[PDB]
Amino acid sequence: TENFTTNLNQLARVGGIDPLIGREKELERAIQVLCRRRKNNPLLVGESGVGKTAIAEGLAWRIVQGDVPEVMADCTIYSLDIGSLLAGTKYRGDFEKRFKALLKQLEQDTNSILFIDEIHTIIGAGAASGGQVDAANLIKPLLSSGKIRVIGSTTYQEFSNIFEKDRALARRFQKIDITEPSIEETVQIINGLKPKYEAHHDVRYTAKAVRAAVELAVKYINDRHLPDKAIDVIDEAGARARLMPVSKRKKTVNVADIESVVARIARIPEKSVSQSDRDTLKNLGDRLKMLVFGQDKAIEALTEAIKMARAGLGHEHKPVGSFLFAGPTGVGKTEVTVQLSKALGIELLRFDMSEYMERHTVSRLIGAPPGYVGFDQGGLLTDAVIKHPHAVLLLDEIEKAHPDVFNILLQVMDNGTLTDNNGRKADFRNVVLVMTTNAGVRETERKSIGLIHQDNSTDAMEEIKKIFTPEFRNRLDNIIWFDHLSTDVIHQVVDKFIVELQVQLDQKGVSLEVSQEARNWLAEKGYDRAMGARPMARVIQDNLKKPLANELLFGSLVDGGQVTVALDKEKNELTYGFQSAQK
Amino acid sequence: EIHTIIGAGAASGGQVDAANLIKPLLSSGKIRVIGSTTYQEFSNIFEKDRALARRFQKIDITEPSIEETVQIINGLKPKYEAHHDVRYTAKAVRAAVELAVKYINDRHLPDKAIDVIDEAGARARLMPVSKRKKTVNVADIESVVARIARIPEKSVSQSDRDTLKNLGDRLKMLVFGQDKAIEALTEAIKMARAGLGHEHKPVGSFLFAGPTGVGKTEVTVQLSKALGIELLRFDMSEYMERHTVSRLIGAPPGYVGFDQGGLLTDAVIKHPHAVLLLDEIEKAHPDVFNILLQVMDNGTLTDNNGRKADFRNVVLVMTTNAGVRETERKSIGLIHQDNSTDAMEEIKKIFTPEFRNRLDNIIWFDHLSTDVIHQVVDKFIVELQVQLDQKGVSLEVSQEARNWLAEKGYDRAMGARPMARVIQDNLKKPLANELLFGSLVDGGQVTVALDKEKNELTYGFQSA
Amino acid sequence: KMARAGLGHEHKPVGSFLFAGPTGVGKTEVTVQLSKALGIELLRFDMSEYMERHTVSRLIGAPPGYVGFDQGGLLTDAVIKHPHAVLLLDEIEKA
Amino acid sequence: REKELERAIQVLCRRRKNNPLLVGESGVGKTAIAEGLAWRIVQGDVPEVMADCTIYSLDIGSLLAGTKYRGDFEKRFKALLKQLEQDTNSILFIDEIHTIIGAGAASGGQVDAANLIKPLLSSGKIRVIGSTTYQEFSNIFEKDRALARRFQKIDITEPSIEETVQIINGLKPKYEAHHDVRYTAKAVR
Amino acid sequence: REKELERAIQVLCRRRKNNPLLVGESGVGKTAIAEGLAWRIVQGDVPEVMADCTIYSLDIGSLLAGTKYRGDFEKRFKALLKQLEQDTNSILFID
Amino acid sequence: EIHTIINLIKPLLSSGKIRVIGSTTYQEFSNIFEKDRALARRFQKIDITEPSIEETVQIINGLKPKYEAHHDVRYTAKAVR
Amino acid sequence: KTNDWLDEKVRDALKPPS
């Protein structure tokens, strides 16, 4: 039955499978089960990547090497292929003939074992008819008798929902739980496997590189398991060297190479930031200030927090930064957050919390639980952060949302992870969480009933404490209150708005020049402390956009031409002069 | 397994089955045939074919008594003893039935007890190369049952014994204050290994309620690391809705998510000995508490599939923030009042009286004292030092500087978390600029001192 | 005119005008005539129905795992079908 | 798409689990990357190791067609895998890779293409490129933890406006020929 | 339906993604527009490129019925696609 | 009892070559016919209402000669009403 | 008062005539 089964020992001697390091207790338990008089069938149930197939195939490698008990010295393991058995079983009884013949051969030798990988498949082996007859039923009598020994390997999910369903088959197979190895165990495993990977890639792995891969993988790569996770980084690093230049770093791969590979797999900013990134970070605050005038403290907090994470002083299991922006309307809480993403070139995960007003809406962020119509949709927040781990999470109008949503963000701020309905765990370590709240807006604009109008800035903080539970506030890195928009700052805003108009105007071929006198007139006409900088847009729209639009649609400005705006002190009104540049 | 013969043929044209070939003969009664089937298969497969079920006479078979099972092992003792060349003591066979049924629940009594005998003989036969020990002692039976059931309960090892003794001391080094909480966890865990543990309840069911910033979660998280066991951390904010509770015990059969199974039961099955940290239990729906009531007393929870998860070795620690607003509430009057009693009343309102009775102990975490905060500041500096070591930088903080940091950030209501924020602004922010662009880019050195005249810290960086 | 001319906000709707006036003053009718003059769909929405907070879910739809999730939101679906239209919200104060 | 392609070559040259997976939103260009490699291979721009390798595309419908008889599906799937192993320089491209999880199998039977292909992917004998959307990758492909471990995810982020204009300029000769028109430079931008 | 039909031809003439989708309310002549294209082609009232083309109406119900096997649907569906693929001019309609 | 069956029902209706008569319960109509737009459009609802008390006796009287011939015994007019 | 809304092919064997 060479077509259906392959001898692991023969493969081990000439080619080899993998050197097995450790797992002494797991092998001893498996060997003890095989030596049992009855029901001597070990089942290596474990999580994916733990090494369920290494222990089963390692036994053959150990047997040829001779580091096994005397009873197992003559034992031979065969790897069954379910596909090969069903390759040509079109006719009735063909599969039974092949399967029965295979089991019969094992009984005659009485000194061999069968390794069925992904054993969950044989519960539903080829059965043309509806009858329960299948490989599991065929092998069930032999297992109880003890004539043959068959090793098994299946995941917890498959074993619990497929293998367990068959109570008779489960009884014969003695479950052996495989547990993920420790950090120390994994580094030793890589050292034993290092020669095999070094030869294929023609590289030499430094001791620091192997240790860093295991430690870095656990910290950033969470979905996979540690033994598989470390080998992936080590294997990928070797591949890069083969594809690197002819003689730059072929001889050895340093820790820096390992750090870069981990960053690409997890989509996290690489360690040892480049000079280009340093220039962007150094000028991040300066550039942000140009777009958003004033509110330097808010910009400093965001930039300083981002600088700490890249520097290597970031929180162990918390996001880069949690900031609650509270202030009067028009200050620029949303604008600074939006500009931060553009400056850093990272995706902006904008979530309008007004939509999630009711408690039931909380399911949208984490997905509906299993057994409901919304299971397939998943969680908007979890899916978004998974797609874009490095991003700015802008939860605008957070106060509008129900307090239930605040509870969901407790683990995000402290644990640094959120769990989806499907069970997937999101990573919030590299996301910048910014929450804009308009709490106390009514109080701050309100004028107190007294001879002296008390500043209501303090009052706003009281509503924040009432709206948000104390645990939520403690997890936050800081609450940055936007004080107000000064008159001098408003003058700059007029220039910024005119610049926005100029780019829009450039598309139509019209160039606008505004005199300094006209700019000052706009600021005084529309300056409102309570409304912030939003009225500036309205005065500019009515004063400048409305005349230009009429001329642009019908008039001299149909074809792009320069326009001049000047202030007449006698009339205290803007003077618009249009000059056609067509000819 | 007579259920199989009902089918066995569906090929085109023949339209024949084994049951149909033998159906006339059975109806005639000339031939008599014995059969065996599982209860589920008989109701679902054999019962469907009324003709076969009508003819066959059902004979119920059920697990025998404890006394009857040990007798069976004695009867089967010559066979197993001959193969392994071992001899089992009378006490050993009795221990296997009692120990296996106590810890192994999925399997029925006959095979479950015999599985220990067969494995015990193999272990005794295989363990010594010299074959010095042929007989199977009662102690060996206990060890075999432990591995099969994955229970830590066994004779305490010298290596494991030492760690247990210093569990409280090590926890105190990481978590300062809250000695009552550490004592409760350490004493309960010690009892389980000693054997003075609840027969069908978890080793510990502790509810941790305290002010914000106190180390409730940290002690639970650090306990897992000190004991070298997995941490089954289940955030309970996600389970606010009633329908979400099914996720913990699995969706009912026939739905899209039935296959994935329960998240709590599967995790407990994968890690029998682990710390189950149910943080923010207050936020969870009342239905969640109902499930836990069964776990605390019965000791097992059945999922949609029907498998039972063993919580006997699981350390159940549920952190709660109930009555935390009262803790930070400032009472009217010249002198602030202790609102600890008010917080307990809120916990009593949220948690049913029956729930509290089941809990082993309710530990009210006290506010961090000034002395405790000084230790907290040092702990955070150690974490910063470790991060700096990765970049090749060494940080030395003077004693005067540490006291200054403690006073600036010490708030009784807020807790230890403000200390981290102070360290971030005062220490991490300057280092970050130097690390990215400055003397600390490579192989830096740092010194920190408090300017007594200016009452401001001084940061000295050496390129080195 | 400003939006079509290319001098629009580029991130906000064409206009957000609150017409507050006495009954029978023409606030509702001017909007209806605007749609006819422009030949665009009129997304008439009576806000008197949304007297309480729970009714707001209808505008954006029910979340996953709740009844009526398949139905979707009337306001979101209406705007998607007719991008260029006049979104009238009568009796906004009563909402 | 040099950075995206460069990572794919690194994954393909791995000793084990050398199966790159292209996960991105619809329209990003995952198929272009999988097929673009073949186009570059003919030109020779790819590295020397990649040179002389043939990339094939698997039609799931064709493989499952006329497989009613027991074992017909396994015969076709095991025949193709044998071909890839024998060549040693062929890379399979399975578009909409989530489909193999639900390939030909009986109602009760759990044997699928994913289970059959799982042993070969781990050993590294065959290289299999993949392409699937984020929704399908998380709701279907990731559920099969065993299969996901063998496949290495390669995140694809849609190109910027500046990057997109050059893509149109490179694809402009084909669209111009089909429509017999010339696109102005300003029109493309 | 000149305006609606003209949009369809533009989509069909595209090099890639030349699959027009007709979305409308119930009983709006949605099916007639697709069927009408065939009638227009027969009378030679369509553009020269559209002329000499065949429109095929696929029946999902008939194809699904009678398979009773894993590969029956795939073989017939793949067979149908091969016929359309062989003739470049041929177009399919799926109601 | 068409509701019991309801893939091929839709194609025959859409083709229109052969017209089909369908008897379904009022409860089943809402559950199946109303939910499916295609089935509802092709099928036309004909309301079949129970006859009045006077109508019911008349139906029995109209069919009474058939019954009397079958068993050769008759029922009084008072008895049937 | 919210409400939650909860929400054929087999291979065959052929026998040739004897």
Ligand SMILES: Nc1ncnc2c1ncn2[C@@H]1O[C@H](COP(=O)(O)OP(=O)(O)OP(O)(O)=S)[C@@H](O)[C@H]1O
């Ligand atoms: N103790 C070990 N010694 C050496 N290699 C190991 C060990 N444990 C795991 N491995 C590695 O594990 C890989 C083989 O796959 P496993 O970890 O056995 O998972 P698997 O059985 O393929 O998982 P499933 O069943 O497909 S979910 C190779 O990289 C091995 O080198």
Ligand SMILES: Nc1ncnc2c1ncn2[C@@H]1O[C@H](COP(=O)(O)OP(=O)(O)OP(O)(O)=S)[C@@H](O)[C@H]1O
């Ligand atoms: N400091 C500022 N400098 C320049 N433009 C600003 C500033 N603050 C606000 N704006 C502009 O004002 C408009 C609204 O900005 P937002 O960020 O939405 O304001 P905000 O104060 O955060 O709003 P809410 O309603 O209070 S959340 C945009 O056109 C911004 O560019």
Ligand SMILES: Nc1ncnc2c1ncn2[C@@H]1O[C@H](COP(=O)(O)OP(=O)(O)OP(O)(O)=S)[C@@H](O)[C@H]1O
């Ligand atoms: N007693 C403590 N001893 C040492 N560090 C502590 C202590 N309490 C808190 N910390 C520090 O604070 C962090 C741990 O906070 P947690 O214990 O997780 O908070 P928590 O109990 O979940 O908070 P709430 O507000 O009560 S939900 C780590 O940085 C610890 O070092």
Ligand SMILES: Nc1ncnc2c1ncn2[C@@H]1O[C@H](COP(=O)(O)OP(=O)(O)OP(O)(O)=S)[C@@H](O)[C@H]1O
């Ligand atoms: N980098 C690129 N270079 C050249 N053409 C590209 C590129 N990215 C996208 N395209 C074009 O955009 C399309 C990319 O192929 P698609 O089939 O859209 O890929 P896809 O998005 O992976 O597919 P699905 O079906 O959405 S999973 C083709 O029309 C390409 O010509």
Ligand SMILES: Nc1ncnc2c1ncn2[C@@H]1O[C@H](COP(=O)(O)OP(=O)(O)O)[C@@H](O)[C@H]1O
């Ligand atoms: N300014 C107006 N010009 C012409 N007709 C008007 C005017 N104002 C009100 N009407 C009359 O009343 C109608 C509009 O009333 P409407 O604005 O809906 O009232 P309300 O504001 O009380 O809801 C018009 O259709 C017309 O019949």
Ligand SMILES: Nc1ncnc2c1ncn2[C@@H]1O[C@H](COP(=O)(O)OP(=O)(O)O)[C@@H](O)[C@H]1O
């Ligand atoms: N523009 C049109 N020209 C000719 N007949 C039309 C037109 N629009 C509708 N009809 C007639 O009315 C019917 C509309 O139904 P149809 O659009 O096929 O329904 P559905 O979209 O529900 O399948 C057409 O089949 C045809 O008989």
Ligand SMILES: [Mg+2]
């Ligand atoms: Mg395996």
Ligand SMILES: [Mg+2]
């Ligand atoms: Mg805003």
Ligand SMILES: [Mg+2]
């Ligand atoms: Mg806590």
Ligand SMILES: [Mg+2]
């Ligand atoms: Mg009105």
Ligand SMILES: [Mg+2]
């Ligand atoms: Mg594609």
